[PDB]
Amino acid sequence: VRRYGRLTRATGLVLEATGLQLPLGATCIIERQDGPETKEVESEVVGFNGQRLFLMPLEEVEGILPGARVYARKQLPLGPALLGRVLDGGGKPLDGLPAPDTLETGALITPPFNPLQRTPIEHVLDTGVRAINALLTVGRGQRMGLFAGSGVGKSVLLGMMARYTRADVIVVGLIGERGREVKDFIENILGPDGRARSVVIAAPADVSPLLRMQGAAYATRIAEDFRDRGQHVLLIMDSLTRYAMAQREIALAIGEPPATKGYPPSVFAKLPALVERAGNGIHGGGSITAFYTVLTEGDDQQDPIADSARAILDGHIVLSRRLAEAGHYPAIDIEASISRAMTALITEQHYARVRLFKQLLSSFQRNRDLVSVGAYAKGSDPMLDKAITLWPQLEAFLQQGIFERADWEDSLQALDLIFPTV
Known part of the structure; x- marks a missing residue:
């Protein structure tokens, strides 16, 4: 036995049911008769605003009859x-x-x-x-x-x-x-x-x-x-x-x-x-x-x-x-x-290398718009010297193949080799 309600209106996506009251967010079931049998169509209470029970179907609703029964039934x-x-x-x-x-x-x-x-x-x-x-x-x-x-x-x-x-x-x-x-x-x-x-x-x-x-x-x-x-x-x-x-x-x-x-x-x-x-x-x-x-x-x-x-x-x-x-x-x-x-x-040993990685990374990218001409007379801005020199190594540290696994140890071991003296 249950406490039914019935589908009064069906003029759009949102339906309206009467004679039932469920809390916002709840699975309400609308019955549709496939000839003699009975099948269930899931809907969700999207508003019990003092006017009626507003239902929004999680399925196709073709079939439902006027005043079709509705009841509750989550785990x-x-x-x-x-x-x-x-x-x-x-x-x-x-x-x-x-x-x-x-x-x-x-x-x-x-x-x-x-x-x-x-x-x-x-x-x-x-x-x-x-x-x-x-x-x-x-x-x-x-x-x-x-x-x-x-x-x-x-x-x-x-x-x-x-x-x-x-x-x-x-x-x-x-x-x-x-x-x-x-x-x-x-x-x-x-x-x-x-x-x-x-x-x-x-x-x-x-x-x-x-x-x-x-x-x-x-x-x-x-x-x-x-x-x-x-x-x-x-x-x-x-x-x-x-x-x-x-x-x-x-x-x-x-x-x-x-x-x-x-x-x-x-x-x-x-x-x-x-x-x-x-x-x-x-x-x-x-x-x-x-x-x-x-x-x-x-x-x-x-x-x-x-x-x-x-x-x-x-x-x-x-x-x-x-x-x-x-x-x-x-x-x-x-x-x-x-x-x-x-x-x-x-650790700071690690974080130091991180800051340094970011530094050499930035100095080379913005400056990557001025060296591809010949205007860069290498010897100055040591930051940049130690930038492109290690670049091929860092771009390859960043890049990783889909089937290459970069362990934690492997990652540090890899960073410790591109940067300092462990």
Whole structure:
């Protein structure tokens, strides 16, 4: 037995149901009769505003009859059974295998650690990426952003980290990415070794904005669960840009007006609340380190999503167009990226070499527009002499092949040889 309600109006995307009341954000089911049988169509309460129950379908609604019945009916699969699997925001398998054999589930919500109980970032996370490990050290429990436009190697970089980072588990949220790129990322970027050590939640661009939202919430809840079992997790969220776009579509459909770049206020309450769930746990246990991607429109630090992102993350790695078109991969712009936790994580012997790397790096690039003429009479500005001389070595220190693993030790060992006397 249940407490029904019924679908009164269906004049647009948002439906209206009467004789039922559920809290904002809740899975309401609308019945449609396929001849004699009965099938269920999922919807989500997007507003119980004193007027009626507003429903937004996660599915196709063709079939539903006027005054169709509606009722409530959330839990989701959680645990080791998720490893090597590819599910959607709801947990439905997307890889062909049968739903994970649970025996343990959980609400996608669940309260967060007080920003007090979290253990402070004190350990380095081996990203397996030399440039990051050496010049932008990432701590365990750090929240990083990856800023890149299309076509610069963002996906391939996420693939290197998903394959080499020294974590217990990797959970990848592919929110709003195009279907063929999702498929390509799972099959060609991650491979069989990357898949086996991770959990991939896919909610592609062509899917319901609600499913994309829920998809981001689900990958995060899974990382939280692994964290609660004492596991050190690497959370890859691709992309905050799409998570925000999803929220914009949902907010505009329910009347919320835009506040900034056409984005409603609620979008800026959703970003912080999402990344906030990542970060160290009460240590003795596990942690969550994460990378949140942000799409750059030909380089723009005016874009609100990007601006907002830079403000709540513990640093960020910028991928450069010019380094990409020039064959420089990973296309990491070291001058434009930073890691807040680095100096606290690395010895001064190491950090000294880092500052020096940045120095010789800058002096050679701006000056790279004046020496390709003959105007540079080498012998002056020793900084530049020790710049181009070591250049070929540093460009090759930065550059890393897709299947080359740059260990932490390997990275330092490599930096200690290009720079000083250990």
